Amino acid sequence: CPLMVKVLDAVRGSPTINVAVHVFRKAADDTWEPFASGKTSESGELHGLTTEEEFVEGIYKVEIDTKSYWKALGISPFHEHAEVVFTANDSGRRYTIAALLSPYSYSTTAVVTN
Amino acid sequence: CPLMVKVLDAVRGSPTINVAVHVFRKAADDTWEPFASGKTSESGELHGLTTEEEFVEGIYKVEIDTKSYWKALGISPFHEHAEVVFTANDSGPRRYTIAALLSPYSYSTTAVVTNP
Amino acid sequence: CPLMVKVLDAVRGSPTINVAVHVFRKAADDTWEPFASGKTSESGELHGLTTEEEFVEGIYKVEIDTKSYWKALGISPFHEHAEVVFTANDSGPRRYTIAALLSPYSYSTTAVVTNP
Amino acid sequence: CPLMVKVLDAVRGSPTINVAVHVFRKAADDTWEPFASGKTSESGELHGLTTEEEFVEGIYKVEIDTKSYWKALGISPFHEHAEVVFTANDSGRRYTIAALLSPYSYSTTAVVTN
């Protein structure tokens, strides 16, 4: 898969499990078309969101439901979610979106290889 | 002003100057209404976006135009922008500082919330 | 003061108060000499650690006692502290702001460097 | 291995390759005894630093030579290195030390499992 999502918990020092992630692609009318989604695994990872054929150039949004996660832990969060918006190519790779979560802070990083 | 935005450049170790910032509020429509906008100063800060009267309860989105910043420096960044979405003033008026730290392929955002 | 330390709590979204900060400078010995120390204020900031006269070229270490902070809150953190080591004033006098953002199992540190 | 190190480059969006990492254990006289070391792989990871038998409770320091990395890229860095100091146990796990590097900023996170 050319697109993977890895989420970590900076309060507990652990992968975030069962966190909902939605992926959108920007449409012609500049609205967000649902594209893919899932829930992070026990390793805090989400694989097999798309394929090389489906993942064409364009602008994508990755939305991590961080609020629901912190609610499950009984911790009051600041953000409604974590949103990463990026342009796939040019030109032509494997994308790993990493997210490090705290209740009042998050960081996201793109690891782009091949 | 109950809402302040501060941006830093993690590559140069300096405040980001002239960075565009757009604020939106979720209408009952469920659509995003333009709420306020501006650009960061020399200190990388943006003050006076709004007032205590105007800044009511709601869900707000703060879009920082990081792409324009990096490209002006000859850098092609990963992100289109840095976007912060949060519920404000749910338990009464607060003062919010939104801090962003920018790298070409990474950013972090932190909220500092105080009771005026 | 050419050296300022600022600390934030990423769990509460607030400045960290009464956080111990110890500064060291590498002697020709290659050992760390106690240079200065203090505690953060209500704003999570620590000013007046040193002066332009005293703050010469060298390698400096800034140890933030994050463990004590978290444990006071009933939290058992991963890190013993947050430690920043850097060469200062190599190309002339600069003003340094060391920013730390604290979570129980994670921290980030950023340097903001300006020419006075 | 009960201790792994993963390093990423936030400027290029890539794992950091060939970055020297040194591990120390605090001794009785409170000095840092060299314990293990190596260079990150093509995946920016460093495995097999120690074993379950060797990795006993105590205070450890992990030192990442970030300065040399940025020098190789021709980018002026702020820090001399990135240092993570922590106490292994109590009580009794797999430690992953993650580091996200920028020239004037770094973040480190502990992922502790099992």
How many of the other CB atoms lie within 10 Å of CB of D53? 7
Write the CA distances from A10 to A16, C4, C49, integer angstroms: 9, 26, 30
Write the CA distances from A99 to A92, A106, D112, integer angstroms: 24, 7, 16
Instruction: Name the 3-class secondary structure at B106.
Output: strand
Q: Where are the alpha helices (DSSP H) in chain B?
A: 66-72
Beta-bridge mates of residue D9: D14, D101
User: Closest to B114 (Cβ–Cβ): which among C14, C101, C112?
Assistant: C14
Per domain, the residue ranges of chain B are 1-116
Distance CA(C99)–CA(A108), nearest Å, equals: 19
A1-114: CATH topology is Immunoglobulin-like (2.60.40)
Paired tokens of C57: 């070229």
Distance CA(B77)–CA(B89), nearest Å, equals: 33
Q: What single-letter DSSP state applies at residue A78? A: S
HSE-CB of D109 using CA atoms within 13 angstroms: 27
HSE-CB of B30 using CA atoms within 13 angstroms: 0
* D105–C109 C-beta distance less than 8 A: yes
Give the H/E segment covering residue C68: helix C66-72
The residue length of chain D stands at 114
Give the H/E segment covering residue B60: strand B58-64
Sequence-distant (≥ 6) Cβ neighbours of residue C97 within 8 angstroms? C4, C5, C6, C111, C112, C113
Work out whether strand B3-9 and strand A20-26 pair parallel, antiparallel, or are unpaired: unpaired
Beta-bridge mates of residue D45: D6
Instruction: Name the 3-class secondary structure at B67.
Output: helix
Closest by CA position to C86, among listed C44, C26, C35, C29: C26
Phi/psi of residue A72, nearest 5 degrees: -65, -25
Give the H/E segment covering residue B61: strand B58-64
Beta-bridge mates of residue D5: D46, D97
How close B96 comes to chain A (CA, Å)? 11
The structure tokens 């580091």 sit at D99
Distance CA(B32)–CA(D30), nearest Å, equals: 57
Work out whether strand B95-103 and strand D82-88 pair parallel, antiparallel, or are unpaired: unpaired
Q: Are A19 and A71 in contact (CB under 8 A)?
A: no
Show which residues on chain C lie within 8 Å of chain A, measured between beta carbons: 9-13, 78, 101, 103-106, 108
Distance CA(A64)–CA(A24), nearest Å, equals: 12
Distance CA(D47)–CA(D64), nearest Å, equals: 14
Instruction: Name the 3-class secondary structure at D111.
Output: strand
**Amino acid identity, position B62:** V
Which subunits have 3 or more CB–CB pairs within 8 Å of chain A?
B, C, D
Which subunits have 3 or more CB–CB pairs within 8 Å of chain B?
A, C, D
Core vs surface per residue C102-114: b (16+ CB within 10 A) or e: bbbbbbbbbbbbe
**Amino acid identity, position A32:** W
**Amino acid identity, position A29:** D
Paired tokens of C105: 């199992």
Chain C interface, best mutation among B95, B110, B113, B115, by max C CB count within 10 A = B110
A45 annotated binding-site participant: yes
Distance CA(C77)–CA(D53), nearest Å, equals: 24
Write the CA distances from A31 to A26, A34, B29, integer angstroms: 6, 10, 16
Give the H/E segment covering residue C35: strand C32-39
Instruction: Name the 3-class secondary structure at B79.
Output: strand
Beta-bridge mates of residue C33: C25
How many of the other CB atoms lie within 10 Å of CB of A95? 23
Q: Are B18 and B45 in contact (CB under 8 A)?
A: no
How many of the other CB atoms lie within 10 Å of CB of C37? 15
**CA torsion sign, C75 to C78 to C81 to C83?**
negative
* C85–D81 C-beta distance less than 8 A: yes
User: Closest to C106 (Cβ–Cβ): which among D81, D83, D108?
Assistant: D108
Task: Tell me the CATH class for B1-116.
Answer: mainly beta
Phi/psi of residue A28, nearest 5 degrees: -60, -45
Q: Are B9 and B15 in contact (CB under 8 A)?
A: yes
| DSSP output for B21-38 | EEEEEE-TTSSEEEEEEE
Where on the phi/psi map is residue A48: left (φ > 0), alpha (ψ -120 to 50), or beta? left
Cα–chain-centroid distance for residue D26? 16
Paired tokens of A76: 């009051």
HSE-CB of A103 using CA atoms within 13 angstroms: 22
Give the H/E segment covering residue C69: helix C66-72
Q: Where are the alpha helices (DSSP H) in chain D?
A: 66-72
Instruction: Name the 3-class secondary structure at D68.
Output: helix
Distance CA(C24)–CA(C35), nearest Å, equals: 5
Paired tokens of B31: 């659509």
HSE-CB of D93 using CA atoms within 13 angstroms: 16
Distance CA(B81)–CA(B104), nearest Å, equals: 11
Distance CA(B76)–CA(C67), nearest Å, equals: 39
Put the strands of the sheet holding A58-64 in their side by side order.
Answer: A32-39, A20-26, A58-64, A82-88, B82-88, B58-64, B20-26, B32-39
**Amino acid identity, position B42:** E
The data reach a resolution, in angstroms, of: 2.0
* B109–A106 C-beta distance less than 8 A: yes
Beta-bridge mates of residue B38: B21
| DSSP output for A11-37 | TTTEEPPS-EEEEEEE-TTS-EEEEEE
Instruction: Name the 3-class secondary structure at A98.
Output: strand
How many of the other CB atoms lie within 10 Å of CB of C25? 20
Distance CA(C111)–CA(B12), nearest Å, equals: 9
How many of the other CB atoms lie within 10 Å of CB of A8? 23
Which method resolved this structure?
Answer: X-ray
Binding residues of B for L-thyroxine, by number, are 6, 45, 108
